[PDB]
Amino acid sequence: GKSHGYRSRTRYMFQRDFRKHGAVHLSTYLKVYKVGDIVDIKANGSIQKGMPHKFYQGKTGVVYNVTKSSVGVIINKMVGNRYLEKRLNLRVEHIKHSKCRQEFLERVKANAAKRAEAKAQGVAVQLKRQPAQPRESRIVSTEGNVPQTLAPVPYETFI
């Protein structure tokens, strides 16, 4: 018969990342999670209490409830033709902050500073991001760099 337990199909997921087994380091227990923090869920295999389901491994949500040895994380789940909001009480060994919000909050301090510096100096701030723009025209010199002529190679076996 079929088997669809709570930890089915998780041979390699809750595995403990070769030659980094054993107890976990103490900066996992010293992070400070505030209500609204954006977290990533990566289930520690060695802490069997408070683990998430295998759907939520690698899923990113926000913290809604902060208690003694765990936090409450809000995850959206794709089910049917809608999304539901899921609440997960997971211990802090299976969690870490996102660095993609560290892209944001550091760029907020940069964007707010460049607006103030342009306000005192010559507004037209121009503080949006821009995509990778195409390359400009340039002059490449052949001095010391005379082009070597490369031809296609004949076929050889070499076994």
Partner: protein
């Protein structure tokens, strides 16, 4: 033209600037399109065969 010629005279190669703008013509009809190119073709305003648009060239395009 003069930057090309005055690089050829100087012993160099003037590369042109990369093109900043393309014109795109939808070449294939409506049926049998996978969802990802169909969604992109809806986003580039090319909803019928032989229709064209101008597209600014960045990496996101």
């Amino acid at each position: 033209i003069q930057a090309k010629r005055d690089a050829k005279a100087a012993g160099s190669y003037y590369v042109e600037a990369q093109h900043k703008l393309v014109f795109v013509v939808r070449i294939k009809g409506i049926n049998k399109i996978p969802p990802k190119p169909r969604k992109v073709l809806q986003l580039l305003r090319l909803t019928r065969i032989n229709s064209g648009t101008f597209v600014k060239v960045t990496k996101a395009t």
